[PDB]
Short mmCIF file of C-alpha atoms and ligand atoms in Angstrom, two decimals:
data_model
loop_
_atom_site.label_atom_id
_atom_site.label_comp_id
_atom_site.label_asym_id
_atom_site.label_seq_id
_atom_site.Cartn_x
_atom_site.Cartn_y
_atom_site.Cartn_z
CA UNK A 1 109.40 113.19 118.29
CA UNK A 2 106.04 111.34 118.02
CA UNK A 3 103.60 111.44 120.93
CA UNK A 4 102.37 107.94 121.80
CA UNK A 5 98.92 108.55 120.17
CA UNK A 6 100.69 109.72 117.02
CA UNK A 7 102.68 106.49 117.27
CA UNK A 8 99.44 104.50 117.62
CA UNK A 9 97.96 106.27 114.52
CA UNK A 10 101.13 105.68 112.44
CA UNK A 11 101.25 102.00 113.48
CA UNK A 12 97.52 101.58 112.61
CA UNK A 13 98.01 103.26 109.20
CA UNK A 14 101.12 101.16 108.42
CA UNK A 15 99.40 97.92 109.31
CA UNK A 16 96.61 98.81 106.81
CA UNK A 17 99.11 99.99 104.16
CA UNK A 18 101.36 96.87 104.37
CA UNK A 19 98.31 94.57 104.40
CA UNK A 20 97.87 94.41 100.59
CA UNK A 21 100.78 94.36 98.12
CA UNK A 22 101.39 93.52 94.37
CA UNK A 23 100.35 89.90 93.52
CA UNK A 24 103.05 87.70 91.96
CA UNK A 25 100.99 86.77 88.92
CA UNK A 26 100.86 90.41 87.77
CA UNK A 27 104.56 91.03 88.56
CA UNK A 28 105.53 87.93 86.55
CA UNK A 29 103.25 89.09 83.72
CA UNK A 30 105.44 92.24 83.55
CA UNK A 31 108.53 90.05 82.98
CA UNK A 32 107.03 87.22 80.89
CA UNK A 33 104.12 88.40 78.71
CA UNK A 34 104.35 89.34 75.03
CA UNK A 35 105.32 92.94 74.35
CA UNK A 36 102.76 94.75 72.20
CA UNK A 37 100.55 97.81 72.67
CA UNK A 38 97.37 95.70 73.42
CA UNK A 39 99.15 93.31 75.77
CA UNK A 40 101.05 96.13 77.52
CA UNK A 41 97.78 97.96 77.92
CA UNK A 42 96.09 94.91 79.40
CA UNK A 43 98.78 94.44 82.05
CA UNK A 44 98.43 98.06 83.09
CA UNK A 45 94.63 97.82 83.19
CA UNK A 46 95.08 94.79 85.46
CA UNK A 47 97.49 96.67 87.79
CA UNK A 48 95.16 99.65 87.95
CA UNK A 49 92.18 97.36 88.73
CA UNK A 50 94.07 95.60 91.52
CA UNK A 51 95.04 99.03 92.83
CA UNK A 52 91.41 100.11 93.03
CA UNK A 53 90.64 97.08 95.20
CA UNK A 54 93.62 97.78 97.46
CA UNK A 55 92.70 101.48 97.61
CA UNK A 56 89.15 100.79 98.80
CA UNK A 57 90.41 98.35 101.45
CA UNK A 58 92.96 100.85 102.75
CA UNK A 59 90.48 103.76 102.62
CA UNK A 60 87.78 101.93 104.60
CA UNK A 61 90.23 101.41 107.47
CA UNK A 62 91.31 105.07 107.74
CA UNK A 63 90.28 106.44 111.15
CA UNK A 64 86.93 108.15 110.86
CA UNK A 65 86.32 107.27 107.22
CA UNK A 66 83.34 104.98 107.98
CA UNK A 67 81.69 107.76 110.07
CA UNK A 68 81.42 110.10 107.09
CA UNK A 69 78.24 110.61 105.12
CA UNK A 70 77.90 107.77 102.61
CA UNK A 71 77.89 110.18 99.58
CA UNK A 72 81.10 111.78 100.87
CA UNK A 73 82.73 108.35 101.13
CA UNK A 74 82.09 107.82 97.40
CA UNK A 75 83.15 111.33 96.37
CA UNK A 76 86.50 110.91 98.19
CA UNK A 77 87.15 107.56 96.50
CA UNK A 78 86.27 108.88 93.05
CA UNK A 79 88.12 112.11 93.56
CA UNK A 80 91.33 110.50 94.76
CA UNK A 81 91.49 107.37 92.61
CA UNK A 82 93.75 108.73 89.87
CA UNK A 83 96.08 110.61 92.17
CA UNK A 84 96.40 107.62 94.50
CA UNK A 85 97.03 105.37 91.49
CA UNK A 86 99.89 107.61 90.38
CA UNK A 87 101.36 107.73 93.87
CA UNK A 88 101.32 103.94 94.25
CA UNK A 89 102.68 103.53 90.72
CA UNK A 90 105.63 105.82 91.71
CA UNK A 91 106.27 103.67 94.79
CA UNK A 92 106.22 100.49 92.71
CA UNK A 93 108.37 102.01 90.01
CA UNK A 94 111.07 103.27 92.39
CA UNK A 95 111.07 100.91 95.38
CA UNK A 96 109.15 97.63 95.12
CA UNK A 97 110.66 96.00 91.97
CA UNK A 98 114.02 94.48 90.88
CA UNK A 99 116.04 96.81 88.60
CA UNK A 100 115.04 94.55 85.64
CA UNK A 101 111.29 94.86 86.18
CA UNK A 102 111.34 98.67 86.43
CA UNK A 103 113.06 99.03 83.06
CA UNK A 104 110.62 96.65 81.44
CA UNK A 105 107.57 98.23 83.03
CA UNK A 106 108.77 101.63 81.80
CA UNK A 107 109.09 100.18 78.29
CA UNK A 108 105.63 98.65 78.49
CA UNK A 109 104.10 101.92 79.68
CA UNK A 110 105.80 103.82 76.81
CA UNK A 111 104.29 101.41 74.27
CA UNK A 112 100.73 100.89 75.47
CA UNK A 113 98.89 103.27 73.11
CA UNK A 114 99.18 106.21 75.53
CA UNK A 115 99.84 109.67 74.09
CA UNK A 116 103.19 111.43 74.71
CA UNK A 117 101.18 114.33 76.22
CA UNK A 118 100.56 111.95 79.17
CA UNK A 119 103.83 109.87 79.29
CA UNK A 120 106.22 112.81 79.76
CA UNK A 121 104.62 114.32 82.94
CA UNK A 122 104.28 110.77 84.28
CA UNK A 123 108.00 109.90 84.19
CA UNK A 124 108.95 113.41 85.21
CA UNK A 125 106.72 112.95 88.28
CA UNK A 126 108.26 109.53 89.05
CA UNK A 127 111.78 110.98 88.93
CA UNK A 128 110.73 114.02 90.99
CA UNK A 129 109.24 111.74 93.71
CA UNK A 130 112.21 109.34 93.53
CA UNK A 131 114.59 112.18 94.38
CA UNK A 132 112.71 112.76 97.69
CA UNK A 133 113.82 109.24 98.80
CA UNK A 134 110.57 108.58 100.69
CA UNK A 135 110.17 105.84 103.24
CA UNK A 136 107.21 103.53 103.27
CA UNK A 137 105.63 105.56 106.15
CA UNK A 138 105.85 108.66 104.01
CA UNK A 139 104.10 106.91 101.07
CA UNK A 140 101.42 105.54 103.38
CA UNK A 141 100.68 108.93 104.94
CA UNK A 142 100.73 110.88 101.73
CA UNK A 143 98.31 108.30 100.21
CA UNK A 144 96.04 108.75 103.19
CA UNK A 145 96.28 112.56 102.96
CA UNK A 146 95.45 112.54 99.23
CA UNK A 147 92.41 110.32 99.84
CA UNK A 148 91.12 112.54 102.70
CA UNK A 149 91.36 115.72 100.64
CA UNK A 150 88.55 118.00 101.78
CA UNK A 151 88.56 120.05 98.54
CA UNK A 152 87.13 117.35 96.23
CA UNK A 153 84.01 118.26 94.26
CA UNK A 154 80.59 117.46 95.76
CA UNK A 155 81.78 116.94 99.33
CA UNK A 156 79.00 118.10 101.61
CA UNK A 157 80.87 118.04 104.93
CA UNK A 158 84.36 119.43 104.16
CA UNK A 159 85.10 120.23 107.82
CA UNK A 160 84.57 116.59 108.72
CA UNK A 161 87.21 115.56 106.12
CA UNK A 162 89.67 118.26 107.33
CA UNK A 163 89.52 116.72 110.82
CA UNK A 164 90.49 113.32 109.50
CA UNK A 165 93.27 114.70 107.27
CA UNK A 166 94.95 117.01 109.80
CA UNK A 167 96.35 114.40 112.27
CA UNK A 168 97.90 112.58 109.27
CA UNK A 169 99.52 115.83 108.08
CA UNK A 170 100.84 116.52 111.61
CA UNK A 171 102.43 113.07 111.74
CA UNK A 172 103.90 113.39 108.26
CA UNK A 173 105.34 116.80 109.29
CA UNK A 174 107.13 115.29 112.30
CA UNK A 175 108.58 112.49 110.17
CA UNK A 176 110.08 115.07 107.77
CA UNK A 177 111.85 116.86 110.63
CA UNK A 178 113.15 113.51 112.00
CA UNK A 179 114.34 111.66 108.88
CA UNK A 180 115.82 114.81 107.25
CA UNK A 181 116.78 117.55 109.77
CA UNK A 182 119.41 118.46 107.15
CA UNK A 183 116.47 119.86 105.03
CA UNK A 184 113.96 121.99 107.02
CA UNK A 185 111.73 122.55 103.93
CA UNK A 186 111.35 118.79 103.21
CA UNK A 187 107.73 118.67 104.37
CA UNK A 188 106.84 121.53 101.99
CA UNK A 189 108.74 119.73 99.20
CA UNK A 190 106.57 116.66 99.73
CA UNK A 191 103.41 118.76 99.66
CA UNK A 192 104.80 120.28 96.43
CA UNK A 193 104.49 116.82 94.81
CA UNK A 194 100.75 116.86 95.65
CA UNK A 195 100.55 119.82 93.27
CA UNK A 196 102.22 117.74 90.50
CA UNK A 197 99.86 114.92 91.39
CA UNK A 198 96.74 116.99 90.80
CA UNK A 199 97.77 117.63 87.21
CA UNK A 200 97.17 113.95 86.44
CA UNK A 201 93.42 114.54 86.86
CA UNK A 202 93.44 116.56 83.58
CA UNK A 203 95.93 114.25 81.83
CA UNK A 204 93.91 111.13 82.83
CA UNK A 205 90.56 112.62 81.74
CA UNK A 206 92.25 113.41 78.34
CA UNK A 207 93.69 109.93 77.89
CA UNK A 208 90.20 108.46 78.68
CA UNK A 209 88.04 110.56 76.27
CA UNK A 210 90.81 109.88 73.68
CA UNK A 211 89.81 106.15 73.60
CA UNK A 212 87.07 103.93 72.10
CA UNK A 213 90.57 98.62 74.45
CA UNK A 214 88.05 97.89 77.16
CA UNK A 215 88.64 98.66 80.84
CA UNK A 216 87.29 96.53 83.72
CA UNK A 217 83.82 97.30 85.14
CA UNK A 218 85.41 98.50 88.45
CA UNK A 219 87.67 100.93 86.56
CA UNK A 220 84.73 102.25 84.51
CA UNK A 221 82.72 102.83 87.63
CA UNK A 222 85.44 104.65 89.58
CA UNK A 223 86.65 106.72 86.61
CA UNK A 224 83.06 107.50 85.38
CA UNK A 225 83.81 105.95 81.97
CA UNK B 1 75.72 103.31 89.44
CA UNK B 2 77.15 102.99 92.83
CA UNK B 3 77.01 99.18 92.81
CA UNK B 4 80.67 98.01 92.77
CA UNK B 5 82.31 100.67 94.98
CA UNK B 6 79.36 100.55 97.37
CA UNK B 7 79.68 96.78 97.59
CA UNK B 8 83.44 97.13 98.26
CA UNK B 9 82.88 99.81 100.94
CA UNK B 10 80.02 98.09 102.77
CA UNK B 11 81.15 94.46 102.69
CA UNK B 12 82.54 92.54 105.67
C1 LIG C 1 102.91 101.05 86.72
C2 LIG C 1 101.70 101.02 87.61
C3 LIG C 1 101.77 100.28 88.80
C4 LIG C 1 100.69 100.24 89.66
C5 LIG C 1 99.55 100.94 89.31
CL1 LIG C 1 98.20 100.87 90.43
C6 LIG C 1 99.41 101.67 88.15
C7 LIG C 1 100.45 101.75 87.28
N1 LIG C 1 100.29 102.51 86.14
C8 LIG C 1 100.72 103.88 86.08
C9 LIG C 1 99.65 104.71 85.36
N2 LIG C 1 99.07 104.04 84.22
C10 LIG C 1 97.94 104.52 83.66
O1 LIG C 1 97.65 105.70 83.81
C11 LIG C 1 96.97 103.72 82.80
C12 LIG C 1 95.57 104.36 82.82
C13 LIG C 1 94.63 103.63 81.85
C14 LIG C 1 94.49 102.16 82.24
C15 LIG C 1 95.87 101.50 82.23
C16 LIG C 1 96.44 101.55 80.81
C17 LIG C 1 96.58 103.01 80.38
C18 LIG C 1 95.20 103.68 80.43
C19 LIG C 1 97.50 103.77 81.35
C20 LIG C 1 96.75 102.26 83.22
C21 LIG C 1 99.85 102.88 83.83
C22 LIG C 1 99.65 101.92 85.00
#
């Protein structure tokens, strides 16, 4: 059971996580736009760009994040952007769309000029995560934990990041005991998906160097393209 | 090249 300060932290996180969702114009573009590599690619670029905005807004509200050294703030954002994008994309793919829109988004992703080297681990990861049957609290906390990863490159004050991450891990741990007492290794299973997640750093770097369609200036900045 | 992310982080 959650201590009342753990409850206050969860509630604060969830309010920030629920605050920004997927705009209707993009969602309708999934259903209604022409299907072609260039057009499919553009939709996805537009989803990724909206995600970056949402990610920065959520990150800025994480307890303690604004007290960190300004260079550390940037390193955490840059270091977590891809992983957090994949985590949100899994949530959207499994939970936040009608059955129709998921099938069509999958099709669009599979025909957007992306290599098969990258597609296969992607859908494998989405099916893996989908089989965990995560709640929205679990997605919110895992997103926060991935952002506040103290082992990113060029983080000066790693201990300071550990302190911000640890309370979120403790809460996530209690939610895995509560919502699945059936499975006492469920917490570790979740943290296993973080390992899968980290592989998308290599895959995403590869897909990026293997270009040149234009990205947005925000995407180029946060991906270092 | 901080410009966009920095703007997004610092803005109110
Ligand atoms: C399906 C979903 C929903 C929400 C969000 Cl934030 C992202 C996604 N995607 C899952 C991952 N993905 C990608 O890696 C990209 C990375 C990059 C820009 C853009 C087009 C190409 C090349 C594939 C998006 C598809 C978009």
